[PDB]
Amino acid sequence: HMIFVKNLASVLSQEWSSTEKYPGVRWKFLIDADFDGSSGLSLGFAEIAPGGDLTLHYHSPAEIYVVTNGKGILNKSGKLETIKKGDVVYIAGNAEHALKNNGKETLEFYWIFPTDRFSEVEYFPAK
Amino acid sequence: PRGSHMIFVKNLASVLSQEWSSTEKYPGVRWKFLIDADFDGSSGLSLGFAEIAPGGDLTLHYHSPAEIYVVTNGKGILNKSGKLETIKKGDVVYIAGNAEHALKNNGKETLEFYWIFPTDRFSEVEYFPAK
Ligand SMILES: C=CC(=O)OCCC(=O)O
Ligand SMILES: C=CC(=O)OCCC(=O)O
Ligand code: NI
Ligand code: NI
């Protein structure tokens, strides 16, 4: 029956994760079985630099974004909609989605998966 | 129309027509549902938004699904099954399934946060009082 609090300061020593497939995008893990032994939900924090783009993709689990700073263009399987600080996004499982930062300030958000860990979630490129 | 691959965006202004929920058991607490099968047809995860006024108290309780808090405004005291720890804007909280927990706003600003359940809908979560 664990309960714990976490913020970005708590994971300072965790190096930013990144990948060439998503330019200007980086992320850290805050609630994750591989880090904390938590289960049922897992949560990370992502930063998209201005001009950064998380390209079009999907994964089987449903997913939530909580947008904490900036603004961006969300690609909803081909339909664009602007998101910004204070928005939440629901992304059904296997729904193709993309997010690019078209602003001057950093696009920041948490993501949530109904999985114990991020590493079990399989990303696939959209057709 | 919303299908099994729905993607949508919400904020408080989106749910203006939804009345704030509250209860005398949790004085100074009110909430709305933002991502929820019963309102949106969504599944797998559900999310609401809660505000605790100064002096408000969400009292000690548990439920079988794990839960996450995303604190977005103010300062609170989290009851971690007996331990009192401060949480504030910018924190996230993980609450294991069946872990007893409470949340109190001992500050002078509104304590605001999202909660997330690994459920289709809030309505399926059974709440139990503190043992
Ligand atoms: C740093 C971001 C990342 O790994 O992507 C998470 C967001 C998503 O699943 O679309
Ligand atoms: C009425 C209380 C409420 O919705 O709180 C949700 C957070 C929790 O279940 O601890
Ligand atoms: Ni995704
Ligand atoms: Ni709870």
Q: Which atom of ligand 2 is nearest to the CA of B69?
A: 7
- In the reported structure, the alpha carbon of residue B99 is separated from the centroid of ligand 4 by a whole-number distance in angstroms of 8
Parent domain of B24: 1-131
- DSSP secondary structure letters along B106-130: -SSS-EEEEEEESSS-GGGPPPEE-
CA–CA distance, A95 with B5 (Å, rounded to integer) = 5
- How many separate domains does chain A show? 1
Method used experimentally: X-ray
Resolution in A: 2.2
Q: Which atom of ligand 2 is nearest to the CA of B117?
A: 9
CB contact burial A84-122 (16+ within 10 A = b; e otherwise): ebebbbbbbbebbbbbbbebeeebbbbbbbbbbbbeeee
Tell whether A54 lies on the interface with B, counting CB pairs under 8 A.
Answer: no
Which pairs count as long-range contacts for B108-111, CB under 8 Å and 24+ apart, including other chains? B108/B54, B109/B54, B109/B73, B109/B74, B109/B75, B110/B51, B110/B52, B110/B53, B110/B54, B110/B73, B110/B74, B111/B51, B111/B52, B111/B53, B111/B56, B111/B71, B111/B73, B111/B74, B111/B75, B111/B76
Closest CA to B20 of B56, B49, B40: B49
Q: Min CA distance, A24 vs chain B (Å)?
A: 22
